Symmetry: D2
Subunit: 296 residues, 4 copies
């Protein structure tokens, strides 16, 4: 009983190294037979491509079969910008941007349309919170709005823009986090607020795209992973040790584990699953208390 | 057993008339014996005051004890703007906005401080969505963000600002809606996303303000009430009628009922209640199927 | 704005000392003007009455007003037994039982009917788990079933039996616990399973009684309190310290705080609240992690 | 990307024919390459075997790879009874029950042990409610408990028993229903209470078995499928039709779809997923109003 994506195509918005979930989601979708089209945040695109081409990620490219993952094509992208009339002269002038073009979501989707004409799977695997290090109390309107835009509306734009080239029976998946639903000290700047909306949008978009084009929409609320961004937030390591001590099952969490879950959810086996928020966290979220409390 | 607010001051950002929830809360709080400060949205400000001069809501100010409400002072207010330094000379140029001043949330709170040195209760009963009529799929990033800015971040701003002059042991209340957690056709423009964020932040702010100033923070997920804003949305009547048909108890919903839950939630009686999302909707949210579906 | 129960009557199933929530729920309902009819588990009835009459609970009887709570009448009861044909000869012979009679739920309700003809409020505040000290894995079918019967169906019987004498506009409330919804190590024997069902039944009964007789049904998921039963489970003290360290607001939880919440929920102010599970726990449940983890 | 169960043994308590979910799971698991042990409820046992001798489900045993399922061994089983010492001589006297033996869960598991020394996967796909047709208000304590015993505790028993011969790294799956969390008219006899308990225990057992034997435990909240038991309930068709009308995606639901989610959830792919309640219902549970309501 395979998770079969053979003949399917996927657009993965959010890889820039072999260190996060997106890469992992990509091996899984690759491993299932899907054709990978990666969405790379412009700034990182150059180095990613270079590293990729020269082989920095070769081991990371080894599929379950021993074969290596192939990345069909890499498109530069910035999910905060929907169309060319939207970018600011400052943003355009802003260096890296000079080097690749057609990187707004609308443009990206267009290149893809022209390039392969359609996709089946759409994978959101990005976000950003300029003030993540601040408590909601110390978080500015702009910062808050930035987070919501980058981490939340970014999914709405991509889906909306790609939907027209998504083959019926296709699906999308995103990566959320428990902070949307529970208080997680340290995840500030409106990032919490952002997942909440991302998750809410999943249910809404599920209805809309489901009815519009029989496309499924879900999201995976993932456990902590020392990705690049995570390490940037700076609390992930403790979070990894927290999850290790206190989860129903005690073990490591691996990118791998979120990847397969995503591959499943975007496959035909998951045909009756839509509007979901699946927790791939070793059950952590289901705990009523932490085992490690000094009181115990 | 009284809900006792005597000697308590409350600042209710969110009245513009006597047709919506905010008025009801003022009332209940007035009834609870709290002193009423109000923050009307600048545009509506003049008319509101004017209307509340000619005795347009005289019948509407009568309390349970045939006593009359007494709104201490009305403040001009725009929750999208946190400080003067943030205003668009465009808005500033606007007549209403010219006709008033000190309306930024940072400005609004300083006045209360000077005028009254303090408060104990903050009520948020506003929000705006330029695109409520559009599906997430048809919703602009500008609109989504506007919706999240006026509807979610404004709470953050108000609380963050006023919190300094909140008396430890004080508390806050806001009004959310089910579309945040469940799919509700017609409630668009990212408003649903906005509620999700407003709800997520209640929890996080309960932690933040809870630990910083011993202030409580909750939100009430209210049922449909044909208010002025609900009027605009253009789907409430159906929802109202819908709720009549399909809730556990088949009855009406009156702001009055939302208004009492707020007074309670903001009173000492509710002291071990914080970071909650109390549904005051006649239990509709618990239903697993509409009773009025034709299959039945 | 008072919580007014004047002219109302309440039946409280579950007091045997002034140490738990039921007593607290009783002062609140008393304080609001309701007439108290207590339901005491037979075995404890004798001593409770004795202590009560002689004045062991006099201070505990002091209402907010300085006046003392009055307990209209005490009925003996055993909520595992619905009618006389249900008690086992062993149970009947079982000592304490000899001393009071008419103690099955059906009989109890009858005495009440005959005694006062109707009630408005119904308060469940009991349960029992013979194997609470055992993990679900080490818990026998009987033990599990016992817990469910005593702690869960006990509410269904009482409500069902009392409903016919409940005045329309009346309500009921019960006390649940987070273990139903999240993993709480130490609360075994199927007690976890029991709250889950108690909470589920609240939603169901809310629909049934709501539609049948316009009666409201809710439950309060309470924080830890060193009641007698709690101390019996043996983990409550650590739980109290856990809740103190890790809640959004740091403070003590007091019987008092659950009492007022219950008084509110059973009052007319709560007319649009039914099918609810309200958390009177200092926000504990909303936390995504424990602050006290050694990792932090 | 395969859902690989080769070399894995699975014990599926819950088949009595090819019309329900349990069969589907066996299939998917069969397909996944796992060896199929089955536990038919003694009454249905003879007929099931008989039916599965004459090739009554021959078409129904065909796998995705045109391969045929192959049920290693069928075990007679009654999940209300955990050991022989517990049987009512009344039941024992029963012909079917005479005609078979070793059917108590403790007995059933020892045979598997002897016969196969081990397992890796446990599927629970049964339950019974003598009173499903009665509202909680009309539901007997005997019926409620029977419902909870056959439907909730049986899982506890199976797991608890088999867990000793489960290979660390194994996992369990069960089938629950939305009535546990939401009000669903027609689903009575305390069945709803039973699901709530079954769901609550998944979490707790994920902790227990998770920490004790590194076994995972999840439940799938399935949508309506016109199975034999659903047939009896006498409300599925409506629910089925209802789900067609009001889910995010308007389509059918086939055991097949529940069956695949189980295979995944029990396969290594789902290794960081435990204590979950995955809704495989075409996203209906996320809807906030029935689209088919006449108000609309
Ligand atoms: C601050 C924020 C940011 S984000 O991204 O959003 N994040 N990060 C980190 C983290 C989180 C959470 C946690 C707990 S940690 B978050 O929020 O989220 C996340 C996301 O969404 C996803 C993925 O990520 P990761 O994998 O982790 O990382 P990386 O690898 O680094 O990735 C990222 C990406 O993105 C991109 N971008 C940015 N920006 C942008 C982009 N693109 C376009 N546009 C724009 N603007 C970059 O570059 C890269 O590619 O998932 C998530 N998570 C969840 C859960 C958990 C996690 C961990 N880590 O643990 C994560
Ligand atoms: C749509 C958008 C808006 S909001 O507001 O947010 N909303 N509205 C309406 C509605 C809703 C929902 C529904 C169902 S309907 B929503 O979303 O939310 C809400 C809020 O929170 C509150 C309020 O409302 P109401 O009361 O109803 O009305 P009114 O009276 O009209 O009020 C409003 C207010 O706001 C204000 N603002 C604006 N903007 C601004 C302001 N302020 C300041 N600043 C700024 N910028 C004005 O002025 C006015 O006064 O509530 C809520 N809810 C909830 C739920 C339900 C409801 C009903 N109604 O039903 C409501
Ligand atoms: C083992 C079990 C038992 S019970 O009761 O159910 N419980 N206890 C304890 C506890 C819990 C939980 C926790 C966390 S701790 B449980 O589960 O629950 C409870 C109940 O329900 C209520 C109340 O209680 P309290 O207040 O705690 O205590 P007390 O005072 O002791 O009370 C009790 C009562 O009951 C009665 N009974 C018995 N049995 C019976 C009766 N009656 C009739 N019949 C029969 N059979 C006695 O005697 C008395 O009166 O609530 C609850 N809670 C919840 C939450 C929390 C809590 C704390 N404590 O914390 C409690
Ligand atoms: C009613 C009561 C019973 S139960 O089973 O629990 N159920 N049924 C039906 C129905 C439900 C729900 C609905 C919606 S419908 B219920 O609750 O749950 C269920 C369970 O878990 C499972 C199974 O089912 P189905 O698959 O469907 O069917 P069938 O095939 O017929 O199966 C059953 C079985 O069981 C058994 N048993 C009995 N008793 C006993 C047993 N085993 C052992 N022991 C004892 N004692 C028999 O034999 C058979 O085989 O699933 C579920 N579900 C869920 C959801 C949904 C559904 C549908 N169908 O739709 C189902």
């Amino acid at each position: 009983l395979p998770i079969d994506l053979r003949g399917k195509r996927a657009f993965i918005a959010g890889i820039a190294d072999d260190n996060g979930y997106g890469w992992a989601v990509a091996k899984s979708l690759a491993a299932a037979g899907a054709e990978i089209l990666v969405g790379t945040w412009v700034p990182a695109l150059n180095i990613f491509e270079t590293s990729l081409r020269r082989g920095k990620f070769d081991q990371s490219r080894v599929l379950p079969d021993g074969s290596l993952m192939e990345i069909k094509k890499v498109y530069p992208l910035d999910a905060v910008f929907d169309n060319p009339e939207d970018v600011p002269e400052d943003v355009k002038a802003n260096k890296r941007y000079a080097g690749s073009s057609n990187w707004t979501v609308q443009e990206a989707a267009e290149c893809v349309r022209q390039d392969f004409g359609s996709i089946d799977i759409l994978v959101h695997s990005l976000g950003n919170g300029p003030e993540v290090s601040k408590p909601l109390l110390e978080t500015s309107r702009k910062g808050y709005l930035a987070a919501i835009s980058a981490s939340s509306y970014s999914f709405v734009s991509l889906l909306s823009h790609f939907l027209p080239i998504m083959n019926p029976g296709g699906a999308s998946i995103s990566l959320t986090y428990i902070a949307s639903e529970r208080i997680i000290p340290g995840y500030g700047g409106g990032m919490s607020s952002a997942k909440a909306a991302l998750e809410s949008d999943t249910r809404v978009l599920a209805f809309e795209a489901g009815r519009k084009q029989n496309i499924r929409v879900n999201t995976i609320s993932a456990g902590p992973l020392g990705s690049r961004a995570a390490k940037a937030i700076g609390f992930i390591d403790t979070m990894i040790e927290y999850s290790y001590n206190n989860a129903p099952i005690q073990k490591t969490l691996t990118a791998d584990e979120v990847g397969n879950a995503a591959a499943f959810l975007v496959s035909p086996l998951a045909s009756a699953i839509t509007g979901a928020t699946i927790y791939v966290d070793n059950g952590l979220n289901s705990m009523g208390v932490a085992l490690d409390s000094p009181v115990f």
